[PDB]
């Protein structure tokens with residue numbers, strides 16, 4: 001029952017109560033609605049900036065994947081342990097446009 | 106800011122000036138249109154109530170920050186584990202009653218994620234309207250300076266802060282002194298650029314004098330508080346969790 005963004009590339013991770021650790025979420029079947037839900041869970045209300053798949057660089061062997069047949073349960077409950085992502089990508093999610101100045105180009 | 110130079114407009118668009126009774130007391134960092142990260146020690150009693158506070162974004166000069174040009178604060182949340190004696194967990198959130206309109210001079214800084222993997226002496230910037238010398242007056246103009254992180258083990262040396270630096274703190278500055286934050290900078294940003302993004306690494310918390318040798322700046326370790334910030338932002342306007 002929690003979510004975070006990891007590292008400078010904002011990898012969406014979800015905590016496993018069992019495995020007692022954080023895991024990235026596969027880009028498999030993900031979309032902007034799922035990202036928006038994740039942002040709302042981090043308190044960002046109606047803020048959303050961007051979401052895209054990125055190749056995991058952490059050598060991770062444990063992911064969280066969308067069960068597209070879970071029905072109308074919360075997104076946490078739609079996600080199951082998987083040792084691979086069919087899309088070969090994990091979710092990168094930014095809930096707000098931030099961290100740029102007038103120089104930042 | 107001691108040993109800095111005045112900031113250009115839009116260089117630090119997240120920087121705000123938090124006023125009580127029409128005068129600057131402390132700095133803050135914009136993180137959303139409604140939410141500002143500041144220091145708990147700024148909002149101790151008798152300034153715990155929100156009605157005291159107005160925020161000024163996008164303005165470099167204090168004299169241009171007059172009643173009406175600014176933003177009424179609606180809430181003030183001190184970290185629950187803030188300890189005024191030790192300054193541990195010296196962080197607070199202010200919620201504005203009216204959202205800021207982001208532009209070229211007003212924008213947010215990114216909350217620090219876990220796994221930033223900063224260098225042990227990462228190059229950072231501090232900004233604010235605090236004194237430009239120890240015990241000096243608020244600066245009319247916004248200043249900024251480069252500072253470096255100082256590893257907490259080094260900072261806890263008996264020649265520096267004698268084991269006073271907790272995991273909720275980070276040190277930055279120069280052990281030789283000369284460049285530092287100061288009174289009035291409190292609550293304001295310690296930022297670093299990485300992956301082409303400006304990150305909020307710290308909030309100005311405390312130090313022993315200003316710009317003295319072996320007495321660098323201590324900042325709230327914001328990354329320790331990101332999840333707490335998330336929860337507060339979510340708890341706001343929420344019926345059940």
Ligand SMILES: *[C@@H]1O[C@H](CO)[C@@H](O[C@@H]2O[C@H](CO)[C@@H](O)[C@H](O)[C@H]2NC(C)=O)[C@H](O)[C@H]1NC(C)=O
Nearest residue numbers: 065066067068069070071072078079080081082
């Ligand atoms: C995704 O969700 C569906 C439905 O919620 C899962 O299928 C159910 O599995 C249980 C246990 O085997 C059965 O009792 C149900 O009758 C199944 N219902 C179906 C087929 O809709 C499915 O196994 C889930 N996928 C994964 C990998 O977790």
Ligand SMILES: N=C(N)c1ccc2cc(O)ccc2c1
Nearest residue numbers: 286287288311312314315322
């Ligand atoms: N040396 C510092 N960085 C430092 C930081 C914050 C301070 C707040 C005060 O009220 C007084 C002095 C201060 C000094």
